[model samples]
Target: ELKLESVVIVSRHGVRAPTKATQLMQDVTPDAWPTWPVKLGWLTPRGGELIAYLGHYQRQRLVADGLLAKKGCPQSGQVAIIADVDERTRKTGEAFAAGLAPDCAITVHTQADTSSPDPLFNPLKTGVCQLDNANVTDAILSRAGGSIADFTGHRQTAFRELERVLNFPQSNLCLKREKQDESCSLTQALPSELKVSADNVSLTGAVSLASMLTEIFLLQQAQGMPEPGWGRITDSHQWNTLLSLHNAQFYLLQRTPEVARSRATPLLDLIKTALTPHPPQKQAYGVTLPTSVLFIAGHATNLANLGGALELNWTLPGQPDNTPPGGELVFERWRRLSDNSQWIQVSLVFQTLQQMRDKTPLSLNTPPGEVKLTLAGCEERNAQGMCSLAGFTQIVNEARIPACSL
Candidate 1:
């Protein structure tokens, strides 16, 4: 027995070809990289279909909770969907809506005729949020335990394996740079540093390069390529080792508390708006977003930023990457039948690599992977793993920096 209320989902876009082209990608490996069906960074047909399946599953769950009807389109103002400016994000929103209302007039909102990134989704790129260079550097370094080298050293085995997979000795990058030094290696050249500025923060050099390669490999596997990792990576341990490179870099750069506070406030503020436990017209927040359910289609970094800000952490089962493609951080408001009080549940819902690769249909029986999360400093939770709605509201407010957000 569940007394379900409104919900919000901040989700990563589904699978796409690598965002980078062969120019930079090919330089990393001696082996010829595989080509994708669509343009770089564009969502594939398979990816869109997978998202729809998840959406269909969500609709079924909401219907089971008596929040929606099993037949006919949802009433106007019943649902809202917003996506970033990227083609993949936009299309993912569309696909998600398609499954949610199978053949209904669903509008996935974004700025019209916009090719530029949305500052709400990309505050750092737009410079909407001001951040001092030293602050950003110190934030990342603190998370990395003062030294990027020592931090990356934690994944030294992963570093060597990635180099071996790239055949780094013969790759164009290592070959050219190796000539300059008697002994050269992929993770050795140029070293590593936290690249920080007023409007940006990132990792550079060895760990950075390794991170990109690992993500590319993960994407390849999710895409069901003929030879993911060029057939070198097959077991769980190998996948975990290689994927650790990506997980570590994202944690240092985007998932640090200060960095996430600056970059993720816009989305966090929106989450606050959407999840506020009030009747549909009780306040301006509800008026601005007149929907029982809201969906925000975004990127993995967006999820990481929000996760870091709330101090939320979860190791998703059956998926190696912490923020896997098409992953969603779901915020649900459920009213308890016994007390008639509102409770909030935070969960991560996503497809495992096997589900995506095998194109598994999601439903109540074969649902997408889901794991509930709890906010830091908010321990007054029900046995159902939900906090009071007011407690979650306070948690969100505490995590958001007032100066950040458009």
Candidate 2:
């Protein structure tokens, strides 16, 4: 039997209110979309409950594995919880903390300025560009399926299909745009480096709008809200297509070589320290390792970048993307009692849409499906899909700072 020693979990914030507050929603959604109880980007109460359930399940598993105390709260320094300074992330961390150690006081750390983006979690905040600009650009274009012309053509086709299902010309949102001759064009709207013209909007903005709209519709559907044209586009295939675009956008932006390496360095260093028996006295960015468990809360981009940096590729049984709300990548260290041998394992764990909507309890017995990941430069593996701790550490050190650039 293997004994779990330490765990590091990097999680995406739970479900949240739509990130944008555009008038287009009011015009497009018949009968008006139900108002969110909190601010535009805040976490919902339901999201909080779902994360709490995840925390509870984590506690159960850790206790069973003997990594955490079975009863009572962890003492100071046993557990560390940190999150990006956004309200959604901070709240998610607090909720998870409540479930993990309900009786104990666990301080959730964050940057001093809530309004500023945390470089620890945000790839866009990193100023480092990929040394291989051509390679990075080629990778992004491949995922996006082509040049500006190709993207615009695809977007137009998708827009037409959506319009047909929603009777767009009749909808106020489309009617106004139709009169303005815009008609939801994505032409020349790719990101700055790919933008064909100075007047075009960024692809980042377009993708954000698309993602937000998808969330809005999904939430409204879950609530059983009665709105015109809501059920007309219920086909799983259509939803998947829309979601795929959103997923690809994230992949290109966060998983690109330079962005992923730059953004994931800090988090990976923290994980290294946590797994080291006698880590160097100096810590990275003034953060110390937790004795038992370390919980990191951030956004979907953070999850994607970390996975990419670690050379992880995962596919959920029925999901189209990897970064679902509350998704996590867990790193666990295990030891064998007989020989004092150790191994490191990494798993991509997350909930399905129904599970998130229903607030399903996550436990080891019925745990989230685990997709084992292979670390770059680490060749050895055990039957349990774990790498030798020494090998993992060596690879980690080798890839600590990637030399690729734009």
Candidate 3:
């Protein structure tokens, strides 16, 4: 169990209609459309359910671990929820607080603005000053500080434009450092790593590996049989399977980085050894196990590319017995799809479990240090490198926040 004197809960509101200027809320049924008497930006029942489930899970887990509910009312416990003045967030917070005991003091912070007009984040004045206009997209574009080609180096105009619009960061160092900080406190929570490779694996990293492998297993279970295509999973069944995985990645990432949840957790038995009095001081080096499995599911073109990447002869797994002589069905299919036309919406989750030192404090003598844990979304990676997942999903790169420097 994780040791702690305090707990902090950070959350964003549940899913609702799009708020961006360029994004208009879709109303398939006219009756659902906005009206003079009715206001928008309220949580749907499903949204409320999601919040309730999360609240219950968090409360139960903490209470079971003896971290909460020691004192009663002012003596029992406390909860502080911050929200914008938006109706949706207000209600969401209320729903969250509903699960608490009457004695649990609750504090709420709300901004005085509606959901649509207000921005979730406000840039520094200096950053905002650099924008061409106050237009959100343009403002972002200006802060990016250079042309798109300079950042990515590939000559795709759309990608370049996206770079400008989104103002994606140009360097990996920034991302890596951010991740390192997030998982600072994770050391106390993970099992010791066995180092067969140069890479050191943390208990958290093991969990991530398992999470990826589990996803692949689930995908295969749903597919039944492999089809020859990359992202061309046009059928509803396949689409839903892929979408569910995407949502899982997204949900875990909402506040925490991916590495924290995705990281593989070594068997607890290994860690218990570390706690033994006469533990071996040397690192345990060993051989690597092959638990690698890859999945490619999406559009038709995307499906075809999947095999091409692996240098497999057939479009589907375990095919070729029924092939016509010299017909070359797989090659022909690959040739038909234009590189630009066959866009895949697939997510690849993998882990490089390695051996590394557990960068923990040597002593708790002078003062028991404070540890902070912050959760954020995971950085999305594709064929090239990391990118955003489904527009907003994040991975908890670091699960433990450091309250003191080593």
Q: Sort the predicted structures by lDDT, highest score first.
A: 1, 2, 3
lDDT of 3 at 299: 18
TM-score for every candidate vs. truth?
0.94, 0.82, 0.31
Better of 1 and 3 by lDDT: 1
Candidate 1 structure quality by residue, lDDT tens digits, 337-364: 8889888888999998889878899999
Q: What pairs collide in candidate 2?
A: 130-405, 130-406, 131-405, 131-406, 132-405, 133-406
In candidate 2, what are the lDDT values of residues 49-87, reduced to their tens digit?
778878888999888887788889887567888898888
Scanning candidate 2 in windows of ten residues, the lowest lDDT window is 192-201
Name the lDDT of candidate 3. 0.26
Query: lDDT of all predictions, in order shown?
Result: 0.83, 0.68, 0.26
Return the clash pairs for model 1, or none.
Answer: none
Arrange candidates, best TM-score first: 1, 2, 3
- Candidate 3 structure, TM-score to reference: 0.31
